[PDB]
Amino acid sequence: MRGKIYDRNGKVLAEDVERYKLVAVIDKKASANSKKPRHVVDKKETAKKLSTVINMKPEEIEKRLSQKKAFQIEFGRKGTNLTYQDKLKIEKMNLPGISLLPETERFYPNGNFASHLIGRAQKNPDTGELKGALGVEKIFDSYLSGSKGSLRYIHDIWGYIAPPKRGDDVHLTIDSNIQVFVEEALDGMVERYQPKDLFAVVMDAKTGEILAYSQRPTFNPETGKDFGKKWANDLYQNTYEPGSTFKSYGLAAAIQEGAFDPDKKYKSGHRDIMGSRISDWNRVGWGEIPMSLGFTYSSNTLMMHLQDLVGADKMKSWYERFGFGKSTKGMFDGEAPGQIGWSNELQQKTSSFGQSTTVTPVQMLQAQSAFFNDGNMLKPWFVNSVENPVSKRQFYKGQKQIAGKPITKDTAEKVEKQLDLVVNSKKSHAANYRIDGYEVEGKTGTAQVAAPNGGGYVKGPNPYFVSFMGDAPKKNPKVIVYAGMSLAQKNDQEAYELGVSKAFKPIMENTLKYLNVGKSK
């Protein structure tokens, strides 16, 4: 047995099962040393009796019993992965030459479910040996695998090298109930906007536990549907120019450095940098306004203004101190570090509002956490324990760590106030993320997308990556929800206007409802 992959409530996400394969001996040579024939005598009548399972076409079953001049025959994919009920029925029939060989197959009960995180195990036809090829299944292959007994090693995680054999179980921080809300909501987005890429993550605000995560396009682990298109896990391996989501950190930096004042006015509109008219999102601005409104209205100028006030060399340090351009050191394989765009003044200024600079969605979760844990960035973790369930030996146990405290408690509270405005201001550009009976806050995140291999940015009507980095209930939140959609292909206007609001509202509402947080109607 390969070990199981459980969720945080010990519901099975992956396991081994025994399923059966249909073989028929069709050659008289078998029956040439026996009274009782070990070969299909009546091809016709055996075929009709067999036509109670799978492709029940007696003609096609007969054709294959007549086939070639081979000793045995199999029945493609339809003659494999047959249940124990499917077997007992064909064994009662007691047909001559018909048998069912047991093969162990890797079963994912929910099918397409956190498919890019859990991952998928492939089988060696020869030995029937399962080897994980992506996600948990690849990372913890050795621990899960009941076979070998060489040295046990964790894929990229230097350390944890421990030296009829069952395997070790891997428990995740996932909560199937929540992971549902996400999977449904994401399906909702693919129907509506059919984006080229999409993801959502739920994190415990207080722990850094990943409660739920899917992406699109994903694959189905059970079937191998679409497996090996997008290899990259969005949350851990994929880099983004994150957009307005990333102002939150630029803001904090300023607040602390003393350069930001909610009431102090600044000139909104444009800023000619390196001979480029970098402008607010409405191209004109709103003239002289308070910096509080600028954040509520996602002003690119404000961020550029604040960069000037604080200073470049000082801000690069700030972005570094929020853990950008550096791995989260999470338990996933080949995690992406990203890079802070600072090679020149353009990169620098654009960065302020979240372009040039590249992030993992997790780098961002880490950073946003600080605003709710008194300035402390929580390391996000999805792996709860690796532990053989015979012995109960915990090989790895996960826990809340602290990746840094780049800001004061005070600073954090002020950033929170500004996020509360972004959503619940009178002049809010983002009341589309509001929810009945629950108090929400967060940051809207419209952003251009790079041309994969060279060129500049992707062109189109609305060629945008839209995100939102929300958390509820506001001030003392239980969960963070970060959703992102890249290059909607349908409704590409509604995309620019609503953003990921149509995904965030359901996920958050259902999650809070499920964690039994009270609704002040």
Domain segments of the chain as ranges: 15-105, 176-515
- Rounded CA-CA distance 291/410 in Å is 18
Distances (CA, A) of 245 to 40, 295, 305, 354: 68, 11, 17, 7
Tokens of 27: 């050659």
The reply to whether omega before 37 is within 30° of 0 (cis) is no
- Rounded CA-CA distance 487/466 in Å is 8
183-215 residues labelled b (16+ CB within 10 A) or e (exposed)? bebbeebeebbebebbbbbbbbbebbbbbbbbb
* CATH numeric code, 15-105: 3.30.70.2110
The residue assigned the tokens 């249909």 is 22
- Rounded CA-CA distance 480/369 in Å is 8
CA quadruple 288, 293, 298, 301: dihedral positive or negative? Answer: positive
- Rounded CA-CA distance 137/13 in Å is 11
Beta bridge partners of 468: 444, 483
Q: What is the number of helices (H) and of strands (E) in the chain?
A: 17, 20
- Rounded CA-CA distance 312/68 in Å is 76
Superfamily of domain 176-515: DD-peptidase/beta-lactamase superfamily (3.40.710.10)
> What are the phi and psi torsion angles at 441 (to 5°)?
-155, 170
Q: Which of 142, 176, 214, 244 is catalytic?
A: 244
Question: In Å, what resolution does this model reach?
Answer: 3.0
- Alpha helices by DSSP H, listed for 271-323, are 291-296, 300-310, 312-320
- Rounded CA-CA distance 429/434 in Å is 11
**In this structure, are residues 104 and 128 in contact, taking their beta carbons and an 8 Å threshold?**
yes
Tokens of 366: 């880490």
Helix (H) or strand (E) holding 289: strand 288-290
- Rounded CA-CA distance 336/342 in Å is 18
- Please list, in sequence order, all residues whose beta carbon lies within 8 angstroms of the beta carbon of residue 456, skipping any fewer than 6 positions away: 450
List the strands of the sheet with 210-216, edge to edge.
210-216, 197-204, 479-486, 465-472, 444-445
Does the annotation mark 279 as catalytic? Answer: no
Start-to-end CA span in the chain (Å): 51
CA quadruple 302, 274, 350, 339: dihedral positive or negative? Answer: negative
CA 160 to chain centre: 25
Experimental method reported for this structure: X-ray
Burial class (CB in 10 A: 0-12, 13-18, 19+), 149: exposed
- Rounded CA-CA distance 279/285 in Å is 7
Helix 501-514 with 176-193: angle, nearest 10 deg: 160
